[PDB]
Design a binder for this molecule. Structure first.
Ligand code: FAD
Ligand code: FAD
Ligand code: O1M
Ligand code: O1M
Lengths: 588, 588
């Protein structure tokens, strides 16, 4: 038990010191390592439950049981006297640097998970390389270091969401006594894209500075694992070479899909292209019904665009469908048009994009509805948001032995290990996990600590909260109502719910009964809260704190005995009492 | 145990039915009761663990052990056959209305607590009266039903805070691509006040409708308790009379204090006057440093005013002082002037308020700093925010025997009972309790259920979260850092903290390291979170959900294992790691 943990820690750590906070020979070794700029992990035995047992297990590697023991890459290096001997004879640098591999860790993919893993590993003395490359889109769009969320995801899409929210703030301001005239104000797309892109550029540069300051080697190159320890790299000049590493982390992410129809690749775009587009999209068709599809359609309409969404079946498949319907109904009342039960058959080009005068082209979209009727209409821009997929055949030679599932994602143990013992996978390519930026970051940092600092904590992937940043936002944590009913039966499920109205909406004359919240609870388990759902402003800020309580097993009685903060939207969760079974209206 | 509960429940319930969900004779009685429009409490014995014991205890009152059994004001009325006999003989109506008093419940005070208590009691059949009166301010200001929060508190102050927040939204809009010119836009005070007051008026009316629809008698009269069961009332024609009630709830609240200096009452105003003022205050001095003082100074500055705050000693006495200093520094960097360590000596009138042209007057303020130097400056408006106090020698004859503390608040047991057995107190006048609207509402509703429906649940007053709505908002739950250190010692306290920057502030070029958050934890109790603090936008929405986790005993490990929602401000709580003891900078 203790002995198996110690064996695993010693074999995998790059540089580690076993110590006690109270020993001056420890302190003497720490100071030498600091002065020579040797980073390392440290385990203070006097602050662990069974540190006395660990102290005795170390003798199986060092033949000693005493204070100060330093190891390098699985090898006992010495006690206090021996380390200082190496320091005084200028032998230490070569000892801490000798390795059978070029790197202790190679990270393939420089995004949310990969950068977090690489920076964390280097803090404990692991010699680390991070590889990142951005394959251009069909029209040629490319970007810098940081991954999907930083460049073409959460960061730019929430900034453009905020630009959309400010249109209603302009409207509201007149009712609160400000003298502007909303009807006389317009939006400039390229001015907003320039501000968004300047912030993204400061993030690209910040990550490059962070890697340099942690002594991480950054290679802007495409990586390919050709055997358990060998990574083939190709650079911007198509020069090819090979580097080796002890541990490997796969963190290459996904890219958008295109449907298999004429004209889609040639004449449509995706979210990869939208966030740096040099011209306003104009009259726009969004094909798809994911959160990506609805978030993009929502802010385009708030910025003054003429927007239509083509929905194959339902909105937000996999989310609570009552909440999904309320989200779509709000968008439809505030401008967005919906072509329901409809799919596209072909895109025809009518005008080429005017790259000179900075204007979109013009397209003819032909499709059909699920009963057979026809769809035909012209648009200036067509955006595909019909899902995302990894392309691991680009990354991973089949002979290496890493097992994939039927969707091409990596099959992992609960500690992110693949079917190849030294190879791990994190982020969106880890099969079956929520595909979210904070999950990738936690997985990457927690893994680096297990590999290189002797930690044991695993990532917990259950009950991870979400927020869809549609014009009226939707936050959730836990099960949808229909999933709870399927798992436990309707008779064992109680749902408390209410409409509400933000105080900010009263003077602004906004809608009385559109915001909505509910708690889905299990009767036979002390009214345990299985899922929480809220539609309203600032939904992500509302939901986050409740995720801690749900992690600890909150019940309805816990929400009842907690007192609200007034005046807020969030406080409505503390006084819910209308049940769905009762049939009493939730309006206020 | 069971028998003492049953006797207390039977003695004080107005109309109560003991029942079982499965018994058709009970259903037969229920149907009769609401056809005759008789409201009542119900206790379903099959839904309780010791229902068999309660059923045997009922025989001590009725001489029978079966269900249904119906009681009125402590008296057994009959089983199914007997109730129906009274019904078909038109005797039932007189039975259920027979009382030794005019009312089952008289509530003195029609505010947050009193309205909540009165409506809840009437739902279980208590015949209820709610008394409310508004003593005019020195300049004559008065308002309608609903109490301090609704008319001169939480509601108008947050609407005016929102008006101030919208000025920075106008500034931000240009950076996000909108074409307005912030420098050419101004604010109209009276347009704002008209919109605020129209919403307040809809609340006044809504409460009167609510009382009518719950069969509660509303008396717009001043009440005075002259003996345990006797309330003397004085109406708006100075007509005086007496009403009697079984239970009495005191819920009369507080009003603002004035300092004992010349000119203060004659020429200054308080928050009671500010929210309906017919002219913009102009150049304004705020005397005081409470949350009321800083919130009012904050929105007046955002609306274009020239504002000074005169601080006797410290800001936000009783709140965490690091956070208080950050709140004030932000205010001072955005225009609010502070006269520190300074008190007023006299207010001189230079111009009378111009009631025709709708303009303030002009005042000379003279004061002094604690070292003796002099303060002298002119202002158009002087607002006193130097505390609030009850005036129970106005509500309560000393001969009744209700004990007060040295500050004039009512001394109560943990079930809100005064030293007079039928008299209870809720809300701001209950000594030692947090003075907040949701606390008063919870106390009132829970008390009504114990009096008239046999409930046992008490109000929990510990770890109640707060938010101060200054221009940058400050939310908190639990102990300040200095209180935690005093209680447990500095070596048992660990503080995790970080600055942050809202994503919304990046493109808008707002400040990098002004928002701030920390967790104050107890080392020897598994790093229990003793206090949570955050300074930033939407701080009340951020804080609320974590108050459930703190109620449940959250530790630092609970925050660490919960995953963040991205991009939000709140997610920064899920990844904190810099400790104060380490000396590492919290900047980002
Ligand atoms: C439009 C959109 C909006 C989103 N909004 C949110 C949101 O609000 N909140 C949220 O939590 N999540 C959001 N997400 C999801 C989030 O972006 C992902 O969950 C996250 O980026 C996954 O991180 P990752 O490390 O797995 O991969 P990525 O961030 O995709 O990084 C992988 C990197 O590796 C590179 N790479 C690929 N192959 C190779 C190779 N062979 N060699 C070298 N480098 C390679 C890729 O080009 C990329 O730069 C959004 C996603 C999209 C598309
Ligand atoms: C400026 C300001 C801002 C505030 N902001 C917040 C905030 O954001 N959040 C928050 O939680 N709290 C806030 N508060 C506090 C909140 O207003 C109080 O905690 C709450 O109103 C107390 O309710 P209550 O029922 O105890 O008394 P009140 O609401 O004051 O109601 C008592 C009522 O009884 C009446 N009355 C008095 N004497 C008699 C009598 N003899 N006969 C009949 N009627 C009588 C009074 O006129 C009044 O109408 C604020 C307070 C102020 C002053
Ligand atoms: N034919 C190929 O296999 N690719 C590999 C990736 N590619 C590249 C481009 C830019 C960059 F900065 C890094 C790498 C070059 C061509
Ligand atoms: N004790 C007195 O001298 N009363 C106090 C009550 N006051 C009044 C005014 C308006 C109202 F609607 C109800 C009552 C009149 C004078």
């Amino acid at each position: 038990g203790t002995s198996q943990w110690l064996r695993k820690t010693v074999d995998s750590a790059a540089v580690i010191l076993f110590s006690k906070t109270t020993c001056p020979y420890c302190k003497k070794v720490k100071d030498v390592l600091a002065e020579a700029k040797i980073k390392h992990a440290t385990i203070e035995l006097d602050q662990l439950s069974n540190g006395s047992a660990i102290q005795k297990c170390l003798a199986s590697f060092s033949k000693i049981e005493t204070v100060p023991q330093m190891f390098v890459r699985g090898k006992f290096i010495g006690d206090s006297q021996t380390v200082l001997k190496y320091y005084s004879n200028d032998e230490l640098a070569g000892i801490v640097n000798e390795s059978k591999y070029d790197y202790d860790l190679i990270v393939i993919g420089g995004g949310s998970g990969g950068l977090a893993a690489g920076k964390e590993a280097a803090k404990y003395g692991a010699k680390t390389a991070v590889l990142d490359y951005v394959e251009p889109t069909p029209i040629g769009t490319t970007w810098g270091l940081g991954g999907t969320c930083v460049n073409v995801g959460c960061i730019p899409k929430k900034l453009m969401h905020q630009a959309g929210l400010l249109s209603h703030a302009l409207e509201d301001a007149e009712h609160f006594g400000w003298s502007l005239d909303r009807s006389k104000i317009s939006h400039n797309w390229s001015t907003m894209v320039e501000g968004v892109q300047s912030h993204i550029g400061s993030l690209n540069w910040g990550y490059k500075v962070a890697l340099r300051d942690n002594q991480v080697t950054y290679l802007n190159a495409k990586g390919r694992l050709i055997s358990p320890h060998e990574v083939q790299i190709t650079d911007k000049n198509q020069k090819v070479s090979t580097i080796t590493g002890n541990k490997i982390i796969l963190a290459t992410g996904e890219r958008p899909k295109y449907p298999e129809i004429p004209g889609a690749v040639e004449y449509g775009i995706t979210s990869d292209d939208l966030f740096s587009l040099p011209y306003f999209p104009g009259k726009t068709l969004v094909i798809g019904a994911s959160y990506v599809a609805l978030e993009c359609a929502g802010f385009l309409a708030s910025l003054g665009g003429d927007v239509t969404v083509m929905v194959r079946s339902i909105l937000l498949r996999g989310f609570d469908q009552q909440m999904a319907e309320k989200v779509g109904d709000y968008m439809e009342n505030h401008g967005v048009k919906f072509a329901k039960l409809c799919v596209p058959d072909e895109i025809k080009q009518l005008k080429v994009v005017d790259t000179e005068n900075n204007k979109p082209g013009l397209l003819l979209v032909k499709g059909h509805y699920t009963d057979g009727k026809k769809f035909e209409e012209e648009f200036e821009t067509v955006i595909f948001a019909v899902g995302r997929e990894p392309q691991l055949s680009k990354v991973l030679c089949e002979t290496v032995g890493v097992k994939l599932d039927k969707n091409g994602r990596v099959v992992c143990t609960d500690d992110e290990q693949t079917t190849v013992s030294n190879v791990y996978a994190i982020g969106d390519i880890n099969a079956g996990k929520p595909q979210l930026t904070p999950v990738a970051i936690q997985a990457g940092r927690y893994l680096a600590r297990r590999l290189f600092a002797g930690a044991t904590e695993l990532t917990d992937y259950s009950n991870v909260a979400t927020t869809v940043f549609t014009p009226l936002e939707y936050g959730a944590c836990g099960l949808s109502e229909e999933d709870a009913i399927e798992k436990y039966g309707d008779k064992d499920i109680e749902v408390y719910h209410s409409n509400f109205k933000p105080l900010e909406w009263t003077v602004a004359h906004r809608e009385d009964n559109v915001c909505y919240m509910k708690l889905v609870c299990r009767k036979s388990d002390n009214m345990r809260v299985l899922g929480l759902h809220v539609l309203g402003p600032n939904a992500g800020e509302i939901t986050q704190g409740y995720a801690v309580a749900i992690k600890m097993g909150a019940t309805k009685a816990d929400f009842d005995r907690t007192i609200g903060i007034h005046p807020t939207c969030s406080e409505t969760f503390t006084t819910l009492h209308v049940t769905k079974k009762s049939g009493v209206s939730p309006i206020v």
